[PDB]
Write a protein that binds this ligand. Structure first.
Ligand SMILES: CC/C(C)=C\Cc1cccc(O)c1O
Length: 248
């Protein structure tokens, strides 16, 4: 239950990281090679929230993959409420131990999840599953400037060491063999209105239900710390969307 308790929390939240419906569609506005015969993959799909948004604005089949059964379960449940389970199926797997036929995907999606496998690594390894001239759309943590207060910098150095500046993320994408077709930083309501805000609302009902659990206490204490650091340093970092096209 140590792991499930955390998954259980996010099932009562909008998303697990910065993002919003408008941003997912804006990122999508840059993919122009989709058709009924397209094969799309959402890696680290989570509860599939942004997956349903795609499946409603683009033709083709979508396969969500995520490490936690609990998320994949809700993912399919929701997929069924929208009568989409026919072209949108959830599956439990790992971003590194994938089994996609080489050069079979037209689009690889992944919002706030590539940090698990690593930015550069994802680029390198995921490129193999994309058809030549395919699209990889990911949102990642970025530095807005080359200089940051010690506090916010050390914080990221303790969580995600690969957080870099946009120039460097873009450089890597090209080095990996893609063309940086579209890159943009997420707006702030992607952190407040659609993430931290709805998160807080749940923190209350949730904490009482599992009163005493140190796991849930640690979590809530982290959330507030994160939301706090963002209001105090939101001018030094954020989330950016990278739409990369396979080259060669
Ligand atoms: C499960 C604990 C860990 C693997 C994930 C925590 C985490 C790390 C980096 C960025 C994220 O937004 C995020 O929620």
């Amino acid at each position: 239950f140590d792991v499930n308790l955390i998954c259980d929390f996010f099932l009562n939240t909008e998303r697990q990281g910065p993002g919003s419906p408008e941003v997912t569609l804006k990122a999508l506005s840059f993919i122009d090679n989709l058709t009924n015969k397209s094969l799309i993959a959402d890696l680290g799909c989570g509860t599939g929230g942004q997956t349903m948004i795609l499946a409603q604005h683009v033709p083709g089949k979508i396969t969500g993959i995520d490490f936690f059964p609990g998320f994949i379960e809700r993912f399919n449940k929701n997929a069924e409420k929208l009568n989409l389970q026919n072209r949108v199926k959830g599956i439990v797997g790992s971003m590194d131990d994938l089994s996609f036929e080489k050069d079979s995907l037209d689009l690889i999606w992944s919002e706030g999840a590539i940090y698990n496998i690593g930015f550069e690594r994802g680029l390198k390894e995921w490129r193999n599953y994309l058809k030549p001239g395919g699209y990889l759309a990911v949102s990642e943590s970025v530095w807005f400037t080359d200089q940051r207060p010690a506090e916010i910098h050390d914080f990221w150095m303790s969580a995600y060491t690969e957080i870099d500046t946009v120039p460097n993320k873009v450089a890597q994408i090209q080095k990996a063999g893609y063309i940086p077709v579209a890159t943009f930083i997420l707006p702030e309501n992607c952190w407040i209105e659609h993430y931290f805000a709805p998160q807080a609302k749940a923190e209350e009902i949730f904490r009482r239900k599992h009163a005493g659990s140190r796991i849930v206490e640690e979590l809530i204490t982290s959330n507030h710390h994160e939301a706090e650091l963002y209001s105090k340093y939101k001018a030094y970092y954020g989330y950016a969307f990278f739409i990369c096209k396979k080259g060669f």
